[PDB]
């Protein structure tokens, strides 16, 4: 976040100067990773089961 | 070489607001927590019972 400061009235001395200051940002990142798992099974357990 | 407020002289003048300056006022207490009686001279006399 930036930052103001209270100011004087003059030409002549730094009581009269407006300060300068910065916004900044930064980033974020979604990175896609993979999950998943392998099932095997005999194809006539399969067929003899009934569900 | 500038110009300062202060060489501007009553160019610039001051403003008046009465926002602060009204007051509430308070009663008296007994006039209020007790019986007001009228009185039409100095002295008045109450008998009490006293034995």
Sequence with gaps: ?51 | ADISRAEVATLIQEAYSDTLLAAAKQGSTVLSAFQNVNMGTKTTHLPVLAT
Excluded: H, Q
């Design chain 1, 1 to 51: 976040l930036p930052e103001a400061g209270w100011v004087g009235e003059s030409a002549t001395e730094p009581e009269g100067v407006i300060p300068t200051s910065k916004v900044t940002w930064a980033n974020r990142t979604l990175v896609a990773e993979e999950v998943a798992v392998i099932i095997p099974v005999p194809e006539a357990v399969i067929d003899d089961a009934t569900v």
